[PDB]
């Protein structure tokens, strides 16, 4: 995927690897190397109006 990874305060349960939103879009992941939870946010986009 593509996105911005930030530190997250989500309390993952040990058996859980990643977390999805209401519409089943990946919202958080767990780093396989370091068991830490990273929030994934879409890279900023928006219409350019002139």
């Amino acid at each position: 995927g593509t996105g911005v990874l930030t530190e997250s305060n989500k309390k993952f349960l040990p058996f859980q690897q990643f977390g999805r939103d209401i519409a089943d879009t990946t919202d958080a992941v767990r780093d396989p190397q370091t068991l830490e939870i990273l929030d994934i946010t879409p890279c900023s986009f928006g219409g350019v109006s002139v």
Partner: protein
């Protein structure tokens, strides 16, 4: 009460949720993710699956936009109604029945609400009704008298002329009534005295 606005919010949210959930559908393709197909299959093989995904997602987007156009036509109808009610209920007093609430409209006050407007429709509702005997006209000296603005009522023995929407009886004189005819054509005309304000004045 705010169901009308909450329903609109919910409908728009549901449409967006459906649109996003449509991104997880294969639509007949091998996978619902473009990245997986691109990373696994070479372009000559992957183009068919990507075409299936493109057609499915374009149809999903078109359905969303078309239902948004139908829903926005509905919202424009409601906004035209709200603009008319602002012009007639708030900027005026409406003679239209039930346009500005049940009752006889007095005034209205706008209150903004999220993605909408709330009209506080002040109306006059007649309350405590009394039966009376009524007569279309009144015979006095042969002439038939009809109320200028009002209705002839009788509390049993006496005849008064009152305004129609609020019982305020008054003695029947020639200022209350106008004359037309000779008491032979009216169906339901009754005999009663019509006072003359000028007569006592000339007497004294």
């Amino acid at each position: 009460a705010l169901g009308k606005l909450q329903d609109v919010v919910n409908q728009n949210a549901q449409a967006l949720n459906t649109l996003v959930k449509q991104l997880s559908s294969n639509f007949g393709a091998i996978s619902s993710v473009l990245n997986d197909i691109l990373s696994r299959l070479d372009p000559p093989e992957a183009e068919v699956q990507i075409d299936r995904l493109i057609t499915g997602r374009l149809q999903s987007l078109q359905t969303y936009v078309t239902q948004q156009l139908i829903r926005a036509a509905e919202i424009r109808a409601s906004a035209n109604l709200a603009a008319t009610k602002m012009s007639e209920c708030v900027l005026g007093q409406s003679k239209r029945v039930d346009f500005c609430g049940k009752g006889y409209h007095l005034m209205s006050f706008p209150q903004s609400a999220p993605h909408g407007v709330v009209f506080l429709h002040v109306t006059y509702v007649p309350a405590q009704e009394k039966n009376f005997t009524t007569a279309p006209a009144i015979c006095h000296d042969g002439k038939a008298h009809f109320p200028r603005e009002g209705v002839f009522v009788s509390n049993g023995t006496h005849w008064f002329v009152t305004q129609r929407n609020f019982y305020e009886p008054q003695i029947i004189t020639t200022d209350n009534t106008f004359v037309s005819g000779n008491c032979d054509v009216v169906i339901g005309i009754v005999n009663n005295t019509v006072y003359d304000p000028l007569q006592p004045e000339l007497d004294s």
